[PDB]
Write a protein that binds this ligand. Structure first.
Ligand code: HEM
Ligand SMILES: Nc1cccc(N)n1
Length: 291
């Protein structure tokens, strides 16, 4: 199955920077969301979940088709809570009806990371909306009550290696888990709407205790009020993952560079870019634009 990137008719860098700006401005405006965490975190999760349905074996799923807009995927139990991100992007899509859903969902994630002071994430346009019959079935996203072995195997389907997996998980420093959405409760750190390498520092420096939350699920909690999912904790349980966790905890720049590459790769999995397609766009933040 092949998905060839097709640039929205006549659009260029400037058009997409305008969409980015609209998203960034709304992020700044609607600051009260989720007890003032803002929509940054949920937008990053949305971009990851619409991309995380991909299967390298047959190229089903993936961000290309923007299938999250269809009820089967929209209602995936694994996507509980993402409706908030979708609603946030609705007015954006209304103003820029020309951008495809896949491009909008993925751009939302890139915009969020950058506006939260994270690394620059090159982004490519061209995803094209596909029929409702192309929507992937539920169950392709990962479980959180598993171990390192599960995590490693799961991500091989997304063509991600150990380093890429550990780097991507760093996004768990963002936002929080919500009991009503996933059966887990609590943030991973203190700075939950600013993109940093705090995820790794906390895994290594906090004293975690295996407890049961009000949904009767086990999770690791610290006195500081932070939490880690069993899958997050597996990163310091597995010796190979542990080495990488230590690396990122001690090199903020390295983490930023590796996360950027892995996140762009995640958002582009399944897409074939023509040799003459535009080069990846690197959008300026509102701050860099003096906006
Ligand atoms: C091992 C794979 C993964 C597991 C099992 C997992 C599990 C979870 C769970 C259970 C939540 C809480 C949802 C809620 O209650 O609202 C969550 C939130 C989150 N996830 Fe992951 N996740 C994984 C991978 C990733 C990756 C690769 C990224 C992005 C690079 C990511 C980004 C996020 C973000 C930003 C949030 C917070 C969302 C919010 O605050 O609304 N996760 N994840
Ligand atoms: N904020 C957050 C989201 C998912 C997992 C963790 N540990 N923390």
């Amino acid at each position: 199955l092949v998905h060839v990137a097709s640039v929205e008719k006549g659009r260029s860098y400037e058009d997409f920077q305008k969409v980015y700006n609209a998203i960034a401005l709304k992020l700044r405006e609607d600051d009260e969301y989720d007890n003032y965490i803002g929509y940054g975190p949920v937008l990053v999760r949305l971009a990851w979940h619409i991309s995380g349905t991909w299967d390298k074996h047959d190229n089903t799923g993936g961000s290309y088709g923007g299938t999250y807009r269809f009820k089967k995927e929209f209602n995936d139990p694994s996507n509980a809570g993402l409706q908030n991100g979708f609603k946030f992007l609705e007015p954006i899509h209304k103003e820029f009806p020309w951008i495809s859903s896949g491009d909008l969902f993925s751009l939302g994630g890139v915009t969020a990371v950058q506006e939260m002071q994270g690394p620059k994430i090159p982004w490519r346009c061209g995803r094209v909306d596909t029929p409702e019959d192309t929507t992937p079935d539920n169950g392709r996203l990962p479980d959180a009550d598993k171990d390192a072995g599960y995590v490693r195997t799961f991500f091989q389907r997304l063509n991600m290696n150990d380093r890429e997996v550990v780097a991507l998980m760093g996004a768990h420093a963002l936002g929080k888990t919500h009991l009503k959405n996933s059966g887990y409760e609590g943030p991973g750190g203190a700075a939950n709407n600013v993109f940093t390498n705090e995820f790794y520092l906390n895994l290594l420096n906090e004293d975690w205790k295996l407890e049961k939350n009000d949904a009767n699920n086990e999770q690791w909690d610290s006195k500081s009020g932070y939490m880690m999912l069993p899958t997050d904790y597996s990163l310091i349980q597995d010796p190979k993952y542990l080495s990488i966790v230590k690396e990122y905890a001690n090199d903020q720049d390295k983490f930023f560079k590796d996360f950027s590459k892995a996140f762009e790769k995640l958002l582009e999995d399944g897409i074939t870019f023509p040799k003459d397609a535009p080069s990846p766009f690197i959008f300026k933040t509102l701050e860099e634009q003096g906006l």
